[PDB]
Amino acid sequence: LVLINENNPLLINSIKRLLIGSIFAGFIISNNIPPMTVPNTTMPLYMKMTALIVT
Amino acid sequence: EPYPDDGMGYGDYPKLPDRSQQERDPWYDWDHPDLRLNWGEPIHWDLDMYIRNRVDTSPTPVSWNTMCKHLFGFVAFMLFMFWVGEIYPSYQPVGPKQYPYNDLYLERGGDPTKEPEPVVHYEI
Amino acid sequence: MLKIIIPTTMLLPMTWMSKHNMIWINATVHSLLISLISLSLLNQLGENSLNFSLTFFSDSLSAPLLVLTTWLLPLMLMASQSHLSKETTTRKKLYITMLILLQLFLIMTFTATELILFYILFEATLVPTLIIITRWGNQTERLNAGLYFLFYTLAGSLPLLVALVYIQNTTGSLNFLIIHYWSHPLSNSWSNIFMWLACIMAFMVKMPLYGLHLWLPKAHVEAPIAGSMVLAAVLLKLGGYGMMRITTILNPLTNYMAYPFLMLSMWGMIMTSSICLRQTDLKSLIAYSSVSHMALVIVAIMIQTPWSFMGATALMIAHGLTSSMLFCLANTNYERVHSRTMILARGLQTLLPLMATWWLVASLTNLALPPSINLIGELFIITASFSWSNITIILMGMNMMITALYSLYMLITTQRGKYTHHINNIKPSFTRENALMALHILPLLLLTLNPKMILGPLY
Amino acid sequence: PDSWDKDVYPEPPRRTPAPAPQTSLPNPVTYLTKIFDLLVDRPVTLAREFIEQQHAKNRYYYYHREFRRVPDITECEEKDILCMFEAEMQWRRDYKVDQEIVNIIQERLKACQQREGESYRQNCAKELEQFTQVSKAFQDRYSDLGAHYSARKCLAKQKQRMLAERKAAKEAAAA
Amino acid sequence: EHGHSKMELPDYKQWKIEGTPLETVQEKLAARGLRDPWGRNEAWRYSGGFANNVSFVGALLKGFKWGFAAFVVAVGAEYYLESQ
Amino acid sequence: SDAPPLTLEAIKDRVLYVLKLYDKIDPEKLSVNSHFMKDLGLDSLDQVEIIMAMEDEFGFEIPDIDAEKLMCPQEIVDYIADKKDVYE
Amino acid sequence: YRHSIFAVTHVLIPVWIIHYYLKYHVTAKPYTVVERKPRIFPGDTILETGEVIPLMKEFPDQH
Amino acid sequence: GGVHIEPRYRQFPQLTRSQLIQAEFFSATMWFWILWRFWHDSDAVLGHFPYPDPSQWTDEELGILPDDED
Amino acid sequence: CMHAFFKAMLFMCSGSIIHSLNDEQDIRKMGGLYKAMPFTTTALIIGSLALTGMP
Amino acid sequence: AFSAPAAYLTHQQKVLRLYKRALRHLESWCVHRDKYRYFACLMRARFDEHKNEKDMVKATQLLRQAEEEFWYGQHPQPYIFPESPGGTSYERYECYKVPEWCLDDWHPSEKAMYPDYFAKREQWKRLRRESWEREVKQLQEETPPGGPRTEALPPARKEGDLPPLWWHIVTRPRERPM
Amino acid sequence: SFPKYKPSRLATLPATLDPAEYDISPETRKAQAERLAIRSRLKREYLLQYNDPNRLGVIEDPALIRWTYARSANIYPNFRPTPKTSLLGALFGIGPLFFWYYVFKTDRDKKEKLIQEGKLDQTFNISY
Amino acid sequence: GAHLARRYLGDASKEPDPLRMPTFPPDYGFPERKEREMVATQQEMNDAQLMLQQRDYCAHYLIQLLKCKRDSFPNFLACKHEQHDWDYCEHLDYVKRMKEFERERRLLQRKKRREQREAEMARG
Ligand SMILES: CCCCCCCCCCCCCCCCC[C@@H](O)O[C@H](CO[C@H](O)CCCCCCCCCCCCCCC)COP(=O)(O)OCC[N+](C)(C)C
Ligand SMILES: CCCCCCCCCCCCCCCCC[C@@H](O)O[C@H](CO[C@H](O)CCCCCCCCCCCCCCC)COP(=O)(O)OCC[N+](C)(C)C
Ligand SMILES: CCCCCCCC/C=C\CCCCCCCC(=O)O[C@H](COC(=O)CCCCCCC/C=C/CCCCCCCC)COP(=O)(O)OCCN
Ligand SMILES: CCCCCCCCCCCC(=O)SCCNC(=O)CCNC(=O)[C@H](O)C(C)(C)COP(=O)(O)O
């Protein structure tokens, strides 16, 4: 008995707000606050990509 | 079978099996479905210990001894390896950070009337 | 003070000449009116005291206890209104007379500028309580409970009389002002050790201390509702009040004579908190909770630091109100159930929602939730004991965790779950019980706004 | 405001930068501040002016109580209960005054620490020194007295400290 | 307003093992000499719109084509506008 | 939730739909009152398999003591209706 | 209209009450509201005094 | 709040065009954002400053004397 | 701050699936929902890619 | 839950219960449908090869290593239906089931609403009042001396009679009262 | 062959792996019959007392009252002083008290000694 | 990483430890011994109140970045030249720290070589 249904404005709107958030808020907050930590400007290339490689 | 005639005051009370009360038949039509009890039946001396809200002796897929062995081994190995890694730390091939004004002497604690030994930094 | 003592005395002729169907109304109204009069005493000053006359004086330690004592009586009448329906007029009037006499004795006790008068009324508070317990009690064990309550108290308090008359013979006066101003150190000698023990044991037995608490569960279980609240709320504070009054002459001996009692209390708090977990009875569970809290108060008083005294007073008032509320709720459950067993009636929250709310609030307050005065007193005592020694924090934290555990166990077993099927006499809660719970709880949440009124003279 | 004296609660001149708009993009902060002023500060200010002008039509005063000085416990007889009572009350009042002094110093310390931002470790050295001195004096005066403190106990503590320091000084000089 | 429309169940003869990976199960059971009585009961899980499945990588790039087209258009517009 | 209020005829239709896809029994011979052990010659294990199939299809599971004594589609329908409190 | 009245009885009135309470009662006592002093950089001008902070010493700028 | 969708019983459920176009639009938006940021900001992942090789550093600037002076 | 956004997203999507599948939580009984629930699957995919650290 | 239990389970019942549990846990292990069907058929094959064994000593010798093998590979996290005694929503609605007798304590102002429901309620109460008097006698005369041996209750035999002890089975609150 | 499941106090033996119900004798069947008989007798009594329209109270349970009495009010009259009971009482009621007394006494002695030497750095310890 | 593997698998005394560095006088290498320059004084860095860990030799670019961010507030990505300059200066500081590490390593190498040569000459 298939009862699949999501056509409810409440669920769609609530999900889409957090969707826009999880897409853009990281960029906005990262670039819109004063720096508080010393940057890691220079790093080995193999260690620079370790997160992406392991993921 | 009563409790053994020891000093403790159990007296004449049946020693029901230490079998818990969560694992009674969940489909039987109990008189008290939440506690899984029947009206008039003898009550375990430690019912308040086994009420499905507390310790239960439900048989587990893995034996108790092997469960204890595996958990203790994992925790002890983790602690030992954390200590070993503490013995051999990990860092980067760099020298210590350099701060300009006498290692920031005035900004860390102060005491300006003491004239600390001045540390100079080596340009390279 | 006579503006308070005289109306309490006039309550007796007022009750005895009332109509047969209007005693409760008159007693409640005039008891509430008396409480309003007692409110004036709360405005203490940073200086010595409100020395009314040569016989009565009021401090900022006596003021909160006096206000609580005067406030409790209307609640006792509303609680006793239920099970005295089928009682003859003369016996109901005798019950109200016993309650009024108890209040009068407590009021005269808490000021009592002289120590011998304090002792006389402190033992006078024992007769109406014993009569109430042994006369209007349901179970057949009320007689043994009354005997235990009488003898445990009297055996401890009898050497106190000898100690007091000896002190009067040597010092020359027992007035508390003179005693405080002319205090001299107690040398380390066997005679002084036994004087210390005599002066302390009489108040430690009533608190009660762990190991001498056997009378309290019996007295609280077998007594009627009003006796239970007057025992848990005010009669337990007599020992602590006396100890904080009398420790002014036992220095510096206490500095090393407090070790056995400190160890006993700091271990008995854990023992009784653990006992509360495995309990088949509600009133017994509440009684053991009271024992744990009073053990904490004992530790605080024996530490003898300003924060200890402030926390002790706050905990005294808070525990009195909370224990009275819990006993009220247990009695309301027992009246419908007629069994007094924790697991016999379950899932009452589905049938009585507002009483479930009252249960939740009372359990949260007992759980020492911030910013209620329960946690204020708790935390003050914790910090003072930490200053005393850094290792006490282990015992105190263990006590806190076990207290939370047994409080929520009491809430969950009686409120949550599926209702018992074979009980069909759970009538909707009356307005009287809801009003009783509201009048119990609202003063606590109001006092959390003005803590300085219950923090004692060392504020 | 003149409600509190500025000398007891000192405050730096609180210099502030000037707006230097680098770009022509209008910042929302200024617009929001302007509208907030317009529809919040004006009604509040009018209500306060009305209340103040109502207060001015009925003005009366309250005075600060002044206490005479009385002989201390040092010049009080052995059993003279009246002089002992007066000295004890005076000592309690002095105790409360000292507590409020320590409270004032603590308030100044906290305010300076919060105000100075990330350079609090350097810019509030004077406040920390003042608090250290006042705390040491208070600890020497009133600490360890016990729950049943009294003028006699504080005097005994002072006498014991004076004996200890006199013995130390005599030993140092005679060495 | 609720779901009341008198829904009608489909015909039972529509569901067949044909075109589903239940052939492999049937064949390997027949090789050792048995059959699955309930084979048709689950044919509906492979018959209708559920027939076509998408790989994990293809699932991840759900909107790659539209996003790539928009990205190329935006980059070209920026190139032709900044060069001015 | 938005779950439609399933009725007796719907339950019977679903039961017969599940049974008719069980190829061990011919759809033409089966009836709502047909037995399992005698009228259709099904094994005990086969009956357990039908019970589990209805279990999976209806989303609720039948206790063994009640599942082992259901032998006709009509009484299966009645048991499901009693479980789910169906009026008509 | 619903939102118009909602923003009035739920937002505006609390703002008025809290602003009054902070402006004329909380700030009356000393040190109740303490603000971190704004950052001062080279080149800014102070409103209270008008003095100009001297600039940097022209550090060598390449890349 | 929504539209009437009826159960299917072993068929694919009804899909409105609104949800399909909305999901496609948001996935496209995410991928376009990722591509645009990677185009503009490549150093955030690949790095911007080369890692120096310590072996290539001559002993002149490292203050090393040829094993005889000191 | 970032984890708030995307983890709340993931839980909201899980709740949507649970409600749509008649209070079913075991993933053994969830099958083809990439086409049955397009907005939910796109939201969950975006949330998972954000969680794993997609650049 | 409905049916009363017997004093013991026969060998057939044990075999059937083991078969059901084994199939359930195999389905839990094999997530997909085709794999489940294949391995369920294989398990049925390996299950029926000892169907025709005659001696009971060897059959009891079997179904012991079978239980041990089941316990070794029991998938320590099996699939449980949401309403099962282990499910995620086992006793979710048990807090909404208010007993019928509570309606006897309603205020007359509350009873003013829903008058027809309370009229039917009075009719049901009268029916129960007479039926109980009949049922107590029927059960008294039907039970054997020495007390009942099993907890199975007899049906109604006469015309106007009703099954003994029916009130609290008929008036269950609901499956989902709210 | 498969690894054996070894039961413990907190993980009991499953009914399926238990061997008592596989060695079946007629007396075991008789025992099960008697158990079911007494259980059904109790159930019938409870159901007769439960469906009664005239009853408007709580069905008193003898088992619950017996359990409460055994737990609470029957401990002392059955108590006898034995070496096991005496040793357990002495240990569990004396050992913790003296242990904590020794710990706190040692800590306070160390603190007082440090105070007398003056090397404690009690600065800012105003409240006590 | 390789240096950690070399230190924890080869000879410990062969190459330094981060904690005790530097182990040689700054003037050992060359005698001119140029000094590092700081362009931000105590007072302006205090007014900018950056951080205690941010008050390093690259502070002036950080102050310029803060000024740029404060001035062009609404356009949060208006100023990136100074951000890149600060990153470049931090990169140069890291390069200098690497130079210090390698210098100490090679100095210790030559010290070990000198000690070995002296010991061999004495033995010979
Ligand atoms: C807008 C206003 C908001 C605040 C309102 C506050 C109202 C407070 C009312 C409650 C008062 C609490 C009772 C206080 C009793 C303590 C004081 C009392 O003992 O004083 C007595 C005096 O009490 C008053 O005369 C009588 C007050 C009793 C009634 C209080 C008001 C509320 C009564 C309500 C009763 C029921 C109302 C009707 C119900 C149907 C004796 O004073 P005395 O020792 O000589 O004074 C010597 C100093 N002198 C010379 C300067 C005077
Ligand atoms: C059971 C439930 C609780 C009830 C109440 C419990 C509290 C009562 C415990 C009494 C507190 C301590 C009593 C004595 C404290 C003094 C310190 C003494 O015990 O230690 C040594 C004393 O040595 C020995 O202890 C001598 C006393 C031995 C005899 C006493 C009985 C000991 C065990 C009895 C326990 C029974 C308690 C309950 C009775 C019913 C130190 O030797 P010394 O420095 O030279 O003398 C110090 C005193 N001076 C300075 C005045 C001279
Ligand atoms: C719940 C049960 C609790 C029971 C409590 C009973 C124990 C109370 C403590 C002892 C009580 C008696 C103390 C005497 C009263 C104090 C009077 C006093 O201090 O005078 C002393 C006198 O001291 C005594 O006489 C004490 C004698 C004690 C005799 C009675 C013993 C009772 C039991 C003793 C042990 C109990 C201690 C622990 C009890 C714990 C609780 C069970 C000074 O003597 P002088 O003549 O002035 O000498 C000066 C010239 N050198
Ligand atoms: C992943 C978990 C794996 C678990 C594996 C479990 C072990 C699998 C192997 C089990 C071995 C056996 O079959 S143990 C064999 C047990 N002994 C017998 O079966 C003898 C006679 N059987 C009967 O009489 C039954 O009733 C019967 C005819 C079956 C049905 O009857 P019905 O006509 O009433 O349906």
Instruction: Print the SS3 string covering B12-76.
Output: CCECCCCCCCCCCCCCCCCCECCCCECCCCCCCCCHHHCCCCCCCCCCCCCCHHHHHHHHHHHHH
Q: Is the Cβ pair G56, L66 closer than 8 Å? A: no
Å between I20 CA and nearest CA of chain F: 8
Catalytically active residues of F, by annotation: 43
Kindly list the distances between the CA atom of residue B30 and the CA atoms of B35, B36, B38, B96, F80, in Å, as whole numbers in the listed order: 9, 6, 6, 73, 21
Kindly report the number of other CB atoms within 10 A of residue B102's CB atom. Answer: 15
Give me the total of CB pairs closer than 8 Å, taking one residue from chain A and one from chain L.
26
Mutation to probe ligand 3, out of C194, C201, C215, C257 (largest number of atoms < 8 A from CB) = C194
**Nearest Cα to Cα of residue E29 among J13, J39, C196, B90:** J39
What resolution does the deposited structure have, in angstroms? 3.3
Chains contacting H (3+ CB pairs below 8 angstroms): A, B, E, I, L
Assess whether chains E and B touch, using the rule of 3 or more C-beta pairs within 8 angstroms.
no
Distance C39 CA to ligand 1 centre (A): 10
Instruction: Quote the CA–CA distance of H6 and C58 in Å, as a whole number.
Output: 78
d(CA E20, CA E43): 7
Interface membership of F82 toward B (CB under 8 Å): no
Residues in chain D with CB shorter than 8 Å from the CB of B106 are 122
Chain F nearest C-alpha distance from J133 (Å): 27
Q: With contacts defined as CB-CB under 8 Å, which chain F residues touch J1? A: 63, 65-66
User: Which residues does chain J have within 8 Å of residue F23's beta carbon, measured at their own beta carbons?
Assistant: none
CA–CA gap between residue E43 and residue J34 (Å, rounded): 10
- What token pair was written down for F17? 């739909």
CB pairs H-L closer than 8 Å: 35
Count other C-beta atoms under 10 Å from residue D25's C-beta. 12
Cα–Cα distance between L51 and L41 in angstroms, integer? 15
Question: Which among J33, J42, J44 has the least Cβ separation from residue E45?
Answer: J33
Q: How far apart (Å, rounded) are the C-alpha atoms in residues L21 and F43?
A: 84
Is some CB atom of chain K closer than 8 A to the CB atom of D138? yes
Q: Which residue has the tokens 């009448």?
A: C77
What is the rounded distance in angstroms from the CA atom of residue D143 to the CA atom of residue D148?
Answer: 12
| Nearest to D113, CA basis, from D129, D124, D126 | D124
Q: B93 and L22: CB-CB below 8 Å?
A: no
DSSP string of C63-76, one letter each residue: HHHHHHHHHHHHHH
Take residue J13 and report the two structure tokens written for it. Answer: 């019942």
Q: Which residue has 């403790």 as its token pair?
A: B8
Of H4, H23, H36, the CB nearest to E71: H36
Cβ pair E69, H34 in contact under 8 A: no
Minimal-distance CA residue to ligand 4 atom 17: J59
Nearest ligand 4 atom to the CA of F44 is: 35
Distance F44 CA to ligand 4 centre (A): 10
Asked if I38 contacts A4 with a C-beta cutoff of 8 angstroms, the reply is no
Residue (of F54, F68, F61) closest to F83 by Cα position: F61
Local structure of G19: helix, strand or coil? helix
- Cβ(J44) – ligand 4 distance below 6 Å: no
Nearest-CA neighbor of L114 among F32, C280, B117, H68?
H68
Measured between CB atoms, does H51 come within 8 Å of chain A?
A: yes
Nearest CA among C358, C444, C374 for reference residue C68: C444
Residue with CA at minimum distance from ligand 1 atom 41: C3
- CB–CB contact A39 L51 (8 Å): no
The values of phi and psi at residue L12, to 5°, are -65, -45
Residue D13 CB contacts under 8 Å (≥ 6 apart), including other chains: G48, G49
Instruction: Tell me, yes or no, if B73 comes closer than 8 A to chain J by beta carbon.
Output: no
Residues 6 or more apart whose CB falls under 8 angstroms from that of D144 comprise D157, K128
Contact with chain J for residue I23, Cβ under 8 A: yes
Inter-CA distances, F12 with D55, E23, F16, F77, Å:
85, 30, 6, 6
Distance separating alpha carbons of residues B30 and I50, to the nearest angstrom: 50
Which residues approach ligand 1 with their CB closer than 6 A? Answer: C 3, 36-37, 39-40
Q: Is J63 in the pocket of ligand 4 (CB under 6 A)?
A: yes
List, as own/partner pairs, every contact residues D152-157 make where C-beta atoms lie below 8 angstroms and the sequence separation is at least 24, other chains included: D152/D73, D154/D91, D155/D73, D155/D74
Nearest Cα of chain F lies from the Cα of J5 at a distance, in angstroms, of 7
Tokens 């040689």, residue located = L24
Neighbour subunits, L (≥3 Cβ pairs < 8 A): A, B, D, G, H
**Nearest chain L Cα distance for residue B118, angstroms:** 13
Tokens of A15: 């999900």
B21 contacts: CB under 8 Å, gap ≥ 6: B35, B36, B37, B44, B47, B50, B51, B52, B56
CB atoms within 10 A of CB F16: 18
Nearest CA to ligand 2 atom 51: C189
H or E segment at C57?
A: strand C57-58
Please give the Cα distance from D42 to D35 (Å, whole number). Answer: 11
End-to-end CA distance of chain L: 40
Exposed / middle / buried, residue I1 (Cβ in 10 Å: 0-12, 13-18, 19+): exposed
- Asked if residues C193 and C253 have their Cβ atoms less than 8 Å apart, the reply is yes
Residue nearest to atom 14 of ligand 2 (CA): C193
Burial of B45 from C-beta contacts in 10 A (0-12 / 13-18 / 19+): middle
CA distance C174 to C119: 11
β-sheet bridge partners, residue D17: G46
Phi, psi of C58 (to 5 degrees): -125, 135
Q: Count the Cβ atoms, other than its own, within 10 Å of residue G38.
A: 16
Rounded to the nearest angstrom, the distance between the alpha carbon of J27 and the centre of ligand 4 is 18
Contact C455, C314 (CB under 8 A): yes
Main-chain dihedrals φ then ψ at residue C57, nearest 5 degrees = -145, 155
Tally C-beta pairs within 8 A across D and G: 67
Tokens of H64: 């090393």
Other C-beta atoms within 10 Å of L99: how many?
21
End-to-end CA separation in angstroms for chain A: 38
Q: Which residues of J touch I24 (CB under 8 A)?
A: 82
CA distances from C159 to C164, C202, C243, C249, E12 (A): 9, 8, 15, 17, 96
Instruction: Pick the residue of D99, D128, D136 with the most K CBs within 10 A to test the interface with K by mutation.
Output: D136
Residue C457 DSSP code: T
How far is it, in rounded angstroms, from Cα C217 to Cα D139? 45
Q: Which amino acid is at K53?
A: P
Residues of A in contact with H2 (CB under 8 A): 5, 7-9
Give the technique used to solve this structure. Answer: cryo-EM
Residues of G in contact with L40 (CB under 8 A): 56
Exposure pattern of J59-72 as b/e (b: 16+ CB <10 Å)? eeeebeebbeebbe
Verify whether ligand 3 is closer than 6 Å to residue C163 (CB atom). Answer: yes
H60 touches chain B (CB under 8 A): no
The C-alpha atoms of residue D130 and residue D142 are separated, in whole angstroms, by 18
Determine the atom of ligand 1 nearest the C-alpha atom of C40: 16
Task: Provide residues with CB under 6 Å of ligand 2.
Answer: C 188-190, 193, 211-212, 260
DSSP sequence for C193-251 = HHHHHHHHHHHHHHTTPTTS-THHHHHHHHS-HHHHHHIIIIITHHHHHHHHHHTTSST
Q: Which of C405, C443, C157 is nearest to C292 (CA)?
A: C405
Q: Between A4, A29, A51, which is nearest I37 by CB?
A: A4
CA of C299 to the centre of ligand 3 (A): 23
Question: Which residues of chain B are within 8 Å of residue F64 when distances are taken between CB atoms?
Answer: 27
Do the Cβ atoms of C440 and C325 come closer than 8 Å? yes
How near does any CA of chain B get to the CA of J76, in Å?
Answer: 6
Residues β-bridged to residue C423: K58
Max Cα distance, chain B (Å): 91
Q: How far apart are CA D21 and CA D17, in angstroms?
A: 12
Query: Which of residues 6 through 65 in chain H touch L, CB cutoff 8 A?
Result: 48-49, 52, 54, 57, 59, 61-65
Q: DSSP letter at A37?
A: S
Dihedrals phi, psi of B14, to nearest 5 degrees: -65, 145
I39 contacts H22 by C-beta, under 8 angstroms: yes
CA atoms in the 13 A half-sphere facing the CB of D107:
16
d(CA J74, CA J32): 18
| Residue F62 vs residues C21, F48, I2, J1: alpha-carbon distances, Å | 62, 11, 46, 9
Cis peptide before C252 (omega within 30 of 0): yes
Which string of b and e fits D117-152 if b means at least 16 CB within 10 Å? ebbbbbbbbebeeebeebbeebbeebeebbbbbbbb
Q: CB burial class (10 A; 0-12, 13-18, 19+) of residue A42?
A: buried
CA of C269 to the centre of ligand 2 (A): 23
The end-to-end CA distance of chain G, in Å, is: 59
Closest approach of G61 to chain D, Cα-based (Å):
21
Distance of CA B108 to the CA centre of its chain: 40
Q: Tell me how far apart the alpha carbons of residues L75 and F57 are, in angstroms, rounded to a whole number.
A: 59
- Atom 14 of ligand 4, residue of closest alpha carbon: J63
Backbone angles phi, psi at L35, to 5 degrees: -100, 145
Q: Are C243 and C301 spatial neighbours (Cβ–Cβ below 8 Å)?
A: yes
Non-local (6+) Cβ contacts of H45 within 8 A are A48, A49, A52, H38, I55
User: Given an 8 Å threshold on Cβ–Cβ distance, is J8 in contact with K41?
Assistant: no
Which residue in B112, D113, A36 sits closest to L53, CA to CA?
A36
